[PDB]
Symmetry: D2
């Protein structure tokens, strides 16, 4: 069966298409860092020729203290995304933490994503499906890949079929994650060949980003979620280019192989 | 350090006190079902002499289908709760899912619960803590017992020191839970010896509910959390077996709680 | 189906019989230490009415370096066991690691133990089985409880139906073990109800020995496996704490074995 | 530090060298099938320029039943390997299961393999080490990658520094294996950069040998281990697909090995 294609503007995400890079930073901690980081991404994607989408969060709804920096907020944040939309013309992506935010954000941004922990809360879901916008579902660390279909079905019944499944690792004992490279195809098959991407940045939680990422891309994915930072979990900003080069070389190579049926 | 006593009216919850039963049903299906389930917990706990708090959700915030049944809602649910208090005089525990529900629910209820999935959502914790109500934290299947101090602290900074921690199992590979009996103490240690209880019915994988519950109770806990149903077709104890089940629990609890202090470190 | 009974001289091991204690020390460090430890176990179990089998390893065949202390070796180790038998009349359990050790060791001890890592080695199982001795199988940390029936079948194939199954924890991520209290019944179920014991000392990947041991005993087991040491410097129980520890175990076992059947599945 | 190089005849194995293929069949079922499968591996690797070592077992030491087919055994097995050497000039790798088997097997074979369940048995390691042969260690499903250093050190104390490390999965809950792609570097790091290969066929939990193999190969490894069979009916690549499969592996390896150095740490 054909691979499902989900379009984010002029960009086309699908499992058998050049991978798409949903990359950016953790949180919009400043308009200067957001501007700075965003630019570096666009010029490199530009140069390398990789479908791109800027990603950043306007709020960290799950930090360990009520008094520890939360972020820009919904209002000030959409402003920063607006002048990024204007300055660089980049497609945007960010996570929503409550139904009430599904619409405000939905217009200002191109892709809204369902946090892992809140990935089963039906209300947040329906408000997102309502929106009709492109959605990035972050697979919970605690749910099997063979379960992702149901979340896809929930959005369908909620009137939205612009869903992208992002693996972000699986629980492996206490305080630790492992990435099941075989999960991708399972999410793939249980969701009408929906497009699957891979958030290497969170599945780590450094020296291994490269290895983890190559491994995933080698499997054959629709995209790659990632975060960077000039002075850092995140990829040092400067290395974004060699990184993507490797990533694109592997993607082009794997997307090029002809079908290989190892079942028989 | 002595054990932390969290009070629910005249009921005291603590790791070295007789266990408290946080028991009920999954969701407030009908007034009749809630009345029948509540009634049986009430007479059985009275007969056995076990402190009791009735549980039921007014809303199922995460069922697989957008259209599947999800309870009477906040409004009707609170009414059913007031009626249960008018009829039985029972303490009540229910879980909240949005910051706004925290206060109206605490106005009716005796213990508000923090769903496992939203255990790290600081806005809910904030709102819940602000009510000053006794809190029951469902430990995520995905966080280690050692990480529970932060949540208890988050409530502390929010003005609330009436937090009870509840184990409900831990992820073990794909779609499977295992209960780490060693985690109870860790949660005690990392939280000023806050009361620790065990949700045997969600941690379940059944004729195994008793074995897991016995194991948990033998460790020595502040309480037990379980759901039951007259006819079980998220697992439930059959209502009619409540009594012989609790008989085993109380016997194990009284025995273990009466044990002379024992340190095996040295 | 009736519980399977495995006997060791005047002792009988079964899931519905008072628990049997397979206790001792890790390795036969010195005959003096073995004597001292063994005397204390006999006195205490004798005084409490607990069936007892003394355990110690003559060799630690799977350490880190080729030079780490491995014990006194087979020959010298048998010497010590003999002296322990003559001096105290104790039954003995020890592990064997190669096919050619099974018979010489069975000639001296009452129970031969199949190490966890070697539980699937066909030649070792057959040599052990032909011996006709009582067998204690350490369940592999990496095999699910539902898989233990095959090991019992293999032993029967080799003429031996005196197999005891012993849980010693399951892999939980890296370098960690968790004890699945629900695994005890599964092992029972897939093995024709073979006796199931719990090795609490190796399950502790501690001041948590009593807690984990209580949890397991409360499930209702055929026995307990434990190691102790005068000065603990894997995680041994302090020798002087043996008595208070066993009073808890017997108390929990008598209570639990004393309960009437309770089916919570219906 | 430089990558450690282990040589096998006119072959060199190292993490920064083109990958080596340790491939063949599971057990030496018959002389005919062994011939047929070896022929095809040689033909295909010869054509693609992939260093190659033929794999097959002379004994399956850990099947479910004592009576099920184990293979031809050590004597008959070495004879078959001999014919392979003479007929095809291939290098050979096989596993050994008892200490006494190491020497006579290393006298015929080029690489001896230490089974995962036995990787920590000191006497087997010592006997294998003393033969002076090239060693392939199957990493236990139950040992963390960071623990592979001790195994390598044990071989060294035994006078053997020709050790290759083979990942074959990590236990993930019950009856499941997950491959940790981050483990390869850990193994590399704690073992003085010993060569690291990947057994994709035993790491399969069906028809996705290709993507698991690709992912591992993309990490950058010293080699790949695989089994195949004319009719597959753990897993086993279908023979006829060997070429297309190896073609992708060689393509990814050349690409990745060709990359400049990328430090994502700063």
């Amino acid at each position: 069966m054909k691979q499902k294609v989900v379009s984010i503007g002029d960009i086309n995400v699908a499992n058998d298409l050049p991978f798409v890079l949903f990359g950016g930073m953790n949180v919009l901690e400043s308009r200067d860092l957001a501007m700075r980081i965003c630019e570096h991404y666009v010029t490199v994607t530009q140069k390398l020729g990789i479908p791109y989408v800027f990603k950043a969060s306007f709020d960290k709804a799950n930090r360990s203290s009520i008094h520890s920096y939360r972020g820009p907020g919904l209002e000030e944040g959409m402003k920063i995304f607006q002048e990024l939309k204007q300055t660089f013309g980049v497609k945007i992506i960010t996570d929503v933490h409550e139904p009430s935010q599904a619409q405000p954000v939905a217009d200002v941004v191109d892709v809204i994503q369902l946090p892992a922990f809140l990935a089963r809360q039906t209300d947040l879901v329906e408000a997102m499906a309502k929106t009709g916008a492109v959605i990035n579902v972050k697979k919970p660390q605690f749910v099997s890949p063979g379960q992702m279909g149901n979340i896809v079905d929930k959005f369908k019944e909620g009137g939205n079929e612009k869903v992208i499944l992002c693996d972000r690792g699986a629980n492996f004992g206490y305080d630790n994650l492992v990435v099941d490279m075989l999960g991708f195809s399972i999410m793939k098959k249980v969701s009408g060949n929906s497009p699957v991407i891979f958030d290497v940045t969170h599945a780590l939680q450094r020296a291994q980003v490269a290895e983890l990422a190559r491994a995933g891309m080698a499997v054959g994915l629709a995209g790659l979620f990632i975060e960077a930072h000039p002075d850092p979990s995140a990829l040092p900003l400067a290395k974004l280019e060699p990184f993507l080069k490797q990533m694109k070389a592997i993607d082009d190579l794997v997307k090029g192989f002809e079908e290989l049926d190892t079942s028989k």
